[PDB]
UniProtKB/Swiss-Prot annotation:
May have promising applications in chemical and textile industries as it is capable of hydrolyzing a variety of substrates including soluble esters and insoluble triglycerides. Can hydrolyze and thus modulate the surface properties of synthetic fibers such as the plastic poly(ethylene terephthalate) (PET), or the textile fibers polyamide 6,6, polyester and acrylic. Optimum pH is 8. Keywords: Disulfide bond, Glycoprotein, Hydrolase, Secreted, Serine esterase, Signal, Virulence. The record marks 26, 105 as: Transition state stabilizer. This is Cutinase 1.
Length: 197
């Protein structure tokens, strides 16, 4: 449901082929929030329960609304938490293909973490999805140091956070359909592009 710690709980002896690390939006519950569960279910359908590990960013990431105003769009502690998860994935399952995603503050967190990530690990992320990307205008729809072809941004018309503001309007809460279809579609495609099948 809203909490998944497949990576942390997982046995190194039987690593999944795909590891998905996701950061929730502000004030959302568990470590997956409102959109994470939908993405997870679809990933499981494609790769099978044992084929993919779903890991939300919990720990120090409190998804505090006020942190959207900090320089990177989230807290330093949150970035360290997500970086640590990528590092854990790399160590626990070196042969797994990674995919990532984030919504709202989680999107900023995903961008910041990926930017700071060691290139060797960053290069293992076959695709990243960002919903209501709070740094969309500032970063010109990109994630620093990460290829455009591996990036997909879902920014609704009227979603003010995609246009340089921190105002939360109705379109910012309308990403359900995207999380159910195009998002997993993109992630699956990106994984298959490098892993074949």
């Amino acid at each position: 449901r809203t909490t998944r710690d497949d990576l942390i709980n997982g046995n190194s002896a039987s690593c999944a082929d795909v590891i998905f690390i996701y950061a929730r939006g502000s004030t959302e519950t568990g470590n997956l929030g409102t959109l994470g569960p939908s993405i997870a279910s679809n990933l499981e359908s494609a790769f099978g329960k044992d084929g993919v590990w779903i890991q939300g960013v919990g720990g120090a990431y409190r998804a505090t609304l006020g942190d959207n105003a900090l320089p990177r769009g989230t807290s330093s502690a949150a970035i360290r938490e997500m970086l640590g998860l990528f590092q854990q994935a790399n160590t626990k399952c070196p042969d797994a293909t990674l995919i990532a995603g984030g919504y709202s503050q989680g999107a900023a967190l995903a961008a910041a973490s990926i930017e700071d990530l060691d290139s060797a690990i960053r290069d293992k992320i076959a695709g990243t999805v960002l919903f209501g990307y709070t740094k969309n205008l500032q970063n010109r729809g990109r994630i620093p140091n990460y290829p455009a072809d591996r990036t997909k941004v879902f920014c609704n018309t009227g979603d003010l956070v995609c246009t340089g503001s921190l105002i939360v309007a109705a379109p910012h809460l309308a990403y359900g359909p995207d999380a159910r279809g195009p998002c997993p579609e993109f992630l699956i495609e990106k994984v298959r592009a490098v892993r074949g099948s």
